[model samples]
Target chain A: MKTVTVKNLIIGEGMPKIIVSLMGRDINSVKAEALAYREATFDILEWRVDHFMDIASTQSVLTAARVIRDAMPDIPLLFTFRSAKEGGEQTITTQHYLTLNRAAIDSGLVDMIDLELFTGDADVKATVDYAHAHNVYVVMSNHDFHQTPSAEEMVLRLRKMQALGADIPKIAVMPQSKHDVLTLLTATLEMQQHYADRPVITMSMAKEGVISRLAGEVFGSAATFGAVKQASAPGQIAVNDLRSVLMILHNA
Target chain B: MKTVTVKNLIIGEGMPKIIVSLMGRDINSVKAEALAYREATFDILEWRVDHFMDIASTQSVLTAARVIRDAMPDIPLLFTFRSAKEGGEQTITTQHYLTLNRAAIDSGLVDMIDLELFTGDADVKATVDYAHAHNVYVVMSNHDFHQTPSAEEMVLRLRKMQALGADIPKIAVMPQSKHDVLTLLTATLEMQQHYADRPVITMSMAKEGVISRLAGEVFGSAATFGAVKQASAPGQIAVNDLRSVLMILHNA
Candidate 1:
């Protein structure tokens, strides 16, 4: 039940230290945006590689990574190439995905990289092992854009991701009905009841499941995502709202 | 693995099924809306009880339920109450949730009652048991409006619901990142692989994870929720969109 350090932030602590997703859409904005978030009291920066406004090649992602790292040497960077299955806008060929992952590592672009658990390629673990060799973190993630799964199923997927070399494993679902939300929280509590080693992050999406976001601190999740103005994901509380709720939940 | 009968029309099987959700905020419009859905070729009817306008009382729910039942008696009526945590415009004390459950059961208002796996008190199982006794379908639902958990936890949660007498278990989450969606599908596959006994439904929410709607057929979901004109949930496909995608996936 110990929190792990992702660069400077410690996840699953009394509360998440905080990891602000940096808008990494532009090559030049990488350094400046990292500095701005640093000024905003942000900890680890989830470099949204999927938000590339003009990324055409792995070299671009590599260059963007290098620029961010040089500017924010201490910040842990988690990279993601959002596939259509999980709400990512950019489309890359399957071979391109592997190439991009390799480019991110070889070019020294990040502190951590995100690997979608369902990338349809069996060669992802090698990519993760490569990152691991360079002390880069790998977070394995899953998304369900429609509804949630049972707790038993969620826990199993997370554990599988961990086995697959994800330093952190996580999943998110859209809750159409109230029952869907409860299913997610219930699964989270149940999986935490039998965690092996790695901390698992679990929650639901949308306005209906907002409490699932604020209450992750109590659910054995390592961290809950928060953004100041841009929520790159669903039901992500603004940093201000999370600060307020965390204060209340900590006191209670 | 099979789509079952909803009033003799095949939905959730080879074809994507459209389940129209009406908040029934106005009791007067409730019946009219129900009839409209039936006329519009919508296969299933979802009655959102949380927004019964001011008439959320027991008698009103019962009345509305009957009106919907009478208006579209052939379609399966999935009645739901969006609790405060899961983003409903309504809030009933924790004390009132079970009361409403009992009222729905006693009045025989719904063909299937959508129960949040955690919303009821200790007697939540009693509510499920009551649904069985009354021969009404019990949809045990869970929602994580924040993030998704792992596959193991997802399985255990559903098992708990099934053991608690849930006929079918429903789970939902909000994905914060692309990898989170993979965790969701993995949870679903493993649940179907190892733990899912009765039918289970899993999905992700929000603009990013809309792939889960028609993907139910390919990714192993019991049914896909679709709307005619307006979306019932954040990531639902339009009924036409679902049909086209369902056909594409069915053949592909």
Candidate 2:
């Protein structure tokens, strides 16, 4: 599998990494979160593009990207624009989504950009191709909200993304039962073993299925979501506490 | 198997029902969303505790409950005070966790209160028990940030909660590899078949694991999460979007 680097931190190495999520709008808030990297002990900061208070134009995205770039010069950043359909507060259209990705990557703001494998938007593959041309890493993501499928279906999704222009392909799902959790983890194992060239970040959500969060490291993912204040999405922990637990487990 | 009622709607039935989320700090927002229930096509409405900006005093929870009750006179309301440790922006001491559950239940403001079944926080269980005693539903949740786990382990944890006294249980995890998604789904199936009497809500978060969000009816979960503008958690679609999609797939 093809691997990528975020500053000095390497992805797809199968070593556990913590990626801190910076939520809230306002470049200043993100700037504060950027400073928090030192205290939280995260490897990279995944900037929530939807969290920005305002990005009315490409210039706005460029300006804000500059703020992020200048503030967190050392730590690499990942950018993603969550759609309103995907639980984001903002309700930008697909055209805007493509535009935002372009402005962010072209402005030289992030080490990587995340997009859905099937965005159902206009020619989204072009976005990935554009990112590749700019040498900007692309993280292709897939999401399922209901029952998990057989391991075969799971592999097909991951492998499909890999076949696409994704530098890193990731997936997530809802686990209704232990078997549901198994479907997800089982897919991760199979993908890691055979399909993925880059490290894949995977998870099982809701209340009963948190085991996937901590164990992803032991599987094949090089990174995990560790939140500072609130979960940007779901199934995350406070970095300060999580790192300590990880350290304890490591020492033990 | 034990089942709970919120108004007339009962979960743990044919399949998990869908619960839409609404967050509003002020009464107008709450009332607006409450009125939207007539137009809402989902099964439940989750009211985030902190969203009630008027909840200034302890009594505010009561008043806020009353307001929601007035608007959602028939719809079951799942009220929650998100803990700082559990990806909640609000920080509540352990004492408050239990006290609020009891208070919220006694006020008849909600049918359920979400509590974390964390490894370290044993006290939260006491609060959940208090809710059960008052006939207030208890949703026991656990979150993992590092990685997803094996299916067997996920079931053991849910089984532990079933033993402890949860009316509803949820688990969220991060799947590192493809097969881990199986761990998530298998655990859900096991719980529904054996351990849980109340409905279970399960999810695999991130981009790949989103299938679980839509699979409740297929997997035997009692309730699923939906959003109006912003999702309460992750891997959720707006109630409108979910309704449209489900309608489209209702035959399939």
Candidate 3:
């Protein structure tokens, strides 16, 4: 399987990498969260730009990214703006979303950028190409907050993301029942085994689906999200607990 | 949900209990295994009688059981004679199986006895009833060594075990693919959520099913098997690794 390297950390090599998200609402909160994460054990640092109050201001967003980058220089940085339609905190028009992502790429503050898979094909392709040209990896993503889709549908989405040139394809869905969680895991394994040429990330949201987050290595999810001070999404466990479980599974 | 108490270790409450198996071939070997487990952190000690070279001799089997009980008096002792049909090392006649289980139950050395669910309805019920009379918990079990059955079929088997008067119903199936592992987890959740009145144990055997062993708390498995020096079944991790993962998930 192909692996992605960021700052010398290899994804898809061994255990699933742990990603802790920063959900600070402003510059000061962002810097504080970044500094607080210095002692946390995680593979990547994800900044949910949708949670930032100054998301519309390029300079402010770039400055916050700079603060995070300076505080944790070695950790791989993932910049994500989860749109309101896809279980994110903030809303932004398609045009604004494109422009903001382009700016993040241009600023060279993020080592990776998250592009929603459902974002219009033309825009997503252009942005993915832009990120690649700038040597920034793209984590193509999709989210279903209500319920998980069929395993086939999830695999199709991951495949589409891969076809669209995403360095890493990712999907997260909420589980309405235990079967739904299995569906998520099934999709992950299918995508990893049959469809994915690159690493894929998949999860079933909420407490019932917490096993999906922990068993990523077994099921073929290349990465998992954990919470630092606050969770960017539902069912995100504490970073320390997440790291412990990951290490246990990895060693086992 | 109903819980079974064996030597004060309450199954089906809080985190899933850890069960480490002893697979020694003789009285001395069994004693050595039991003594070795004294330093291990696990909730139950299962002696795989089928692994014993002197399994046909009542005196020899009893002597081994006494050694295990003496070595680890406080830990719940589970006596399991896995039939060759169910992925065991030895094969025996149905009459011998029944007679051996009855002898173990009557010896009063074991707190729990595993009666295979497919071991004929009439014979299994009689043994279960006999064990209950002697205050020994019966863990009714079934095993599919080749591949996992459908989720509905697995749940059906678990329900059947319960109807046959099992204190705790259990099943272990081999997975041909990752989907099969999910099928096991799915059946576990379905049984626990809808049909189960008492705790049940379910597992997808082998390394691919390792996550199913670890994520029992989320999917409704009451206990998981681990290994001491040798694994009684395929894919059993070390007891130390098993307890660490269980504790991490429990506290998470």
Candidate 4:
């Protein structure tokens, strides 16, 4: 399995690294939250810029990013603006998505950049190329809030992300049945065993799929998300609870 | 798709029934804990007799059972004497196991009886037959705290329970890796889809397999265990937390 390195932290080799999202609305709140995770022993931080009060302002985004980087100097930082259609809080045009992500990479504040794979091929490639040139890792992701796709379809989604040069290929889907959760898990195992070149992230979302979050290391996911306070997504457990459970599972 | 009706409560069809294990050491504590689960909205109660203060006495066991039944009149009650070899507190000979379970059944205080499938073929069969004759459901269970079995082995185990005429076949295994957890889940789906004549219960134990406990409904498990105060098994969440999460998943 391929391991991704961020400073001294090596992911994809042992216990799944804990990645908590910074979902504060203002720069001060974001900085405080970013600093809080240091005490919580979080492995990485994903800044959900979409939740920012001044998200549309590129300068404000970059300024907040710098503050977070300064606050969490050693932790790997990922910048994301999840689309509303993909179970995210924000909605933006394709150009806006590409420009915002490109600006994030250019700002020199992030170790990695999250770009939705379902975005147009040209834009996805452009952003990937830009992040790579800037020596930033790329996390190419897809989300399905309504239903889980077939195993074949799930594999195809991750493989496509790999083909598009994602340092980490990821997919999250909502499961309506135990079989659906199994389909997600089975495809994740298949990808890890045969197809995946780097560590892959896969989740069966909501209560039915919460096990996938805790079982990530065994399933070949390099990282997982917990919340500092408010959860950015459904099924997100509190950082303390998630950390305790992860420690038990990883050690036990 | 099969539903088992115990009084007004219908199990195995809709939301996976939340079964809380009452592990109080004395009758008072046991009754108090059983009474508390009504607020938690637990669907069923498993009186873990092995932990009782006077487990060796038939009168003490029967008295506790009657009080629990009276306290939660609408809730289905299962009497479990989890053996030490199966990660339970008590150890006994095959004859002793039969004697205890028979006494529990005859007491008219329980709606279900848990008989370990590996307790001996003759004893298991006789117990199942006797429980059925008395209108008490039998939950034939297997527990492997050491390691998870192959998918085929797990399926064969559950089917063997069905062959022995168990009303529900249950298995809990300790998974060393995510693949092992998958093996447990895959077997559950296979049994539900092809082999099972009734609803089955399956779990990949410890924190790594906690998902199986919560996702039982989707996986064709008719019931799951949650902690009333403390966990009776590895990875069992508190009943209140488990109930809330199940409600979210069931409603969503």
The C-alpha TM-scores of every prediction are 0.50, 0.51, 0.94, 0.68
Say which candidate scores most in lDDT. 3
Model 2 chain A: ten consecutive residues of lowest lDDT: A243-252
Candidate 4 C-alpha lDDT tens digits along B212-249: 77666666777888877688888887776776555544
List model 1 lDDT by residue over A1-112, tens digit each: 6556866577657764455677766876766677666556555677777777765676677778777778778767777777766877777677777788878876666767
Tens digits of per-residue lDDT, candidate 2, B1-252, equal: 677667777777654567776787777777776777667777777778765665556776676677778876777778877666766667656666567667887876687877778734467666766777777888888776457878788887777677677788778877664455556766777776777566777876654455455455545556667666677776676665555433322322
Q: State the lDDT at A43 in candidate 1.
A: 57
DockQ of 3: 0.63
Mark the regions of model 1 whose C-alpha exceeds 4 Å error after superposition: A29-32, B1-252
User: For candidate 3, lDDT tens digit of each residue in B1-252?
Assistant: 979887788999888898988888887777777777878889998888888897777888888888898888888999999999888889988998988889889999999999998889889989999999999999999999899999999999999998899999999999998889888988899999899999999999988888888988888999999887677788888878888788867766
DockQ of every candidate structure? 0.02, 0.10, 0.63, 0.22
What does candidate 2's lDDT look like per residue over A64-174, in tens digits? 677777877888788977766665668887878888898887877788998887785344678888898887998888766665677798789888887776788877777
Candidate 3 wrong stretches, greater than 4 Å: none
Q: What is the C-alpha lDDT profile of model 1 across B124-203, one tens digit per residue?
A: 77788887788677778888887877767777777788778776788888888645665676677676656756667788
Winner on TM-score (2 vs 3) = 3
Q: What global local distance difference test value does model 4 have?
A: 0.83
Expressed as tens digits, the lDDT of each residue in A131-238 for candidate 4 is 999999999999999999999999999999999999999899999887888888889888998899898888888867776776676666677777677777776676
Looking at model 4, give its docking quality level: incorrect
- lDDT of every predicted structure (CA atoms): 0.70, 0.70, 0.89, 0.83
The order by descending DockQ is: 3, 4, 2, 1
DockQ, computed on Cα atoms, for candidate 1: 0.02
Better of 1 and 4 by TM-score: 4
lDDT over C-alpha atoms for residue A107 of model 3? 87
Q: A126 in model 1: Cα distance from truth in Å? A: 1.6
